Curated annotation (Swiss-Prot):
Subcellular location field: Cytoplasm
Main location: cytoplasm
Organism listed in the record: Bacillus subtilis (strain 168)
Catalytic residues in the record: 63 (proton acceptor)
Name of this chain's protein: Uracil-DNA glycosylase
PROSITE patterns registered for this protein in UniProt: U_DNA_GLYCOSYLASE
Length: 223
């Protein structure tokens, strides 16, 4: 059993499939033979922090950060002591305009995860220094499944879909129940084209205000 019961009751069948066994053998080799991020114990951290029952918001990312000391097994987040990726910085600038929060002196989003924000990357491992190096090795099939089981959940989920790849997931989601907040990506590449001004945090809390749920405290506090 790799995950807590709330997730494992939904996903155990995926872990038994040939594609996962192949992925698991491939990762055993790569963790032994070269530098893979995040640390192997951290691969599923998004799901460890936020249980299936606790999920309120899903923020989809691509693959893990590929530099030393960055990834934590969470989309967008970095560990403490590390500088903020430009996508994260930009996220904090929009948060500041939207909610008012000051920018933190670290880029760890663990507080969001603890409040029900699922920080899911669609690919869960990467070789150091090599973007998208574990693309197409099986992760995308598993994370599509994670989206499927969230779509099937009775209680409504708010999906934040930044950029074109995340928006492709809309087809998997049942929009008669769930809420979609989508924009261009926060990356300095795509940010000024639809992320800034979109007010994604204010808009999620509103979707929570509406379902009788507690809002997220989207502000992080300094170390």
């Amino acid at each position: 059993q790799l995950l807590q019961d709330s997730w494992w009751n939904q996903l155990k069948e995926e872990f038994e499939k040939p594609y996962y066994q192949e992925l698991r053998e491939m990762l055993k080799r790569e963790y032994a033979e070269q530098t893979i991020y995040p640390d192997s114990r951290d691969i599923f951290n998004a799901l460890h922090y936020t249980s299936y029952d606790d999920v309120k918001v899903v923020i989809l990312g691509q693959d893990p950060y590929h530099g030393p000391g960055q990834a934590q097994g969470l989309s967008f987040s970095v560990k403490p002591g590390v500088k903020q990726p430009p996508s994260l910085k930009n996220i904090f600038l929009e948060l500041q305009q939207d909610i008012g929060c000051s920018i933190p002196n670290h880029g760890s989003l663990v507080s969001w995860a603890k409040q029900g924000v699922l920080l899911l990357n669609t690919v869960l491992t990467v070789r150091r220094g090599q973007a998208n190096s574990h693309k197409g090795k099986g992760w995308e099939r598993l994370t599509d499944r994670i989206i499927d089981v969230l779509s099937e959940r009775e209680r409504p989920v708010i999906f934040i879909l930044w950029g074109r790849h995340a928006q492709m997931k809309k087809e998997r989601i049942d929009t008669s129940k769930h809420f979609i907040i989508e924009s261009t990506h926060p990356s300095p590449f795509s940010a000024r084209n639809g992320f800034f001004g979109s007010r994604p945090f204010s808009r999620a809390n509103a979707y929570l205000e509406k379902m009788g749920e507690a809002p997220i405290d989207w502000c992080i506090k300094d170390l």
